[PDB]
């Protein structure tokens, strides 16, 4: 009786019939910034309907030998919708999020996905192979946009930390024999109450296939993955002309 779920916010609604429970990251709901922690003096703007809604990104293809994908937040939403406009005409933003990942398969397939939200995901290089080069990741790798990039060495997450203890972050599983979706609610986590949206990226969302996808020949060999996200309590301040990046 808790396997079904419905999330509505804005003018959008997500329904699921085989769903796990809802994960609130660190047990805190997202909220507007109180006066005791505020430092900016200008009155903030709250669009409160046109930015608090479900936005659907692109769709990846799960093969039999896939590595994994990552999206940087809120770089994924900075060119779409009115949230793409308020983040271009202002200097400061502050918002929570609500991530929902869908991937469905039949009763004859098998596989397991590990979804996880990781804050301050700083990428690294392989340092020129032999380890003597002070290499740096380019701008296309660190901030891919709403497409998202693939992983190269997923055992070390391309940052030197192992996959084996990634579950200390808020996380869920998409096991193909029980459920087909995963959902996390993330509050705003930063050292400063407001920040720029074009030079700072708060967290990264990682989808890594631990158990490989396997099926017998003849079944539907096209397994897609689709990510859907929604800001929660977005505020903005510091108006200035449009600067994209």
């Amino acid at each position: 009786s808790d396997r079904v779920a419905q999330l509505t916010i804005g003018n959008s609604t997500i329904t699921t019939q085989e769903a796990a429970n809802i994960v609130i990251a660190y047990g805190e709901w997202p909220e507007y910034c109180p006066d005791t922690d505020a430092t900016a003096v200008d009155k903030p703007t709250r669009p409160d309907v046109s930015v608090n809604r479900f936005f659907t990104l692109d769709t990846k293809s799960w093969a039999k030998d896939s590595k994994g994908w990552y999206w940087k937040f809120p770089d994924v939403l900075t060119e779409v919708g009115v949230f793409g406009q308020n983040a271009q005409f202002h200097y400061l933003y502050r918002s929570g999020f609500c991530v929902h990942v869908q991937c469905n398969a039949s009763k004859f397939h098998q596989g397991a996905l590990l979804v996880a939200v990781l804050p301050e995901y700083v990428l690294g290089t392989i340092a020129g192979g032999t380890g003597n080069e002070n290499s740096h990741p380019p701008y296309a790798t660190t901030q891919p946009g709403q497409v998202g990039a693939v992983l190269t060495h997923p055992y070390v997450l391309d940052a030197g930390i192992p996959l084996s203890q990634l579950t200390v972050c808020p996380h869920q599983w998409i096991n193909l024999r029980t459920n087909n979706c995963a959902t996390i609610i993330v509050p705003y986590m930063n050292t400063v109450p407001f920040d720029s949206a074009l030079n700072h990226c708060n967290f990264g969302l990682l989808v890594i296939p631990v158990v490989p996808l396997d099926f017998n020949a003849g079944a539907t060999s096209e397994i897609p993955i689709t990510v859907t996200i929604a800001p929660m309590c977005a505020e903005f301040a510091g108006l200035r002309q449009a600067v994209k990046q």
Binding site: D2, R3, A20, N21, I22, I24, A25, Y26, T178
Partner: protein
Amino acid sequence: HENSNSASEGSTINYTTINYYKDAYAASAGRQDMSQDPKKFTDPVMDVIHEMAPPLK
């Protein structure tokens, strides 16, 4: 008294710290608190799960 300027003033540690100067960050560490909250890391779940019932029914 002393112009209180430490790192831990909002939610602080035990009251056994020793200080001879006028600034509070010169003080010792003292003994620590025994307070802990595990359930915001081991149970970050909206609907409450009981240990007796099936969790996925």
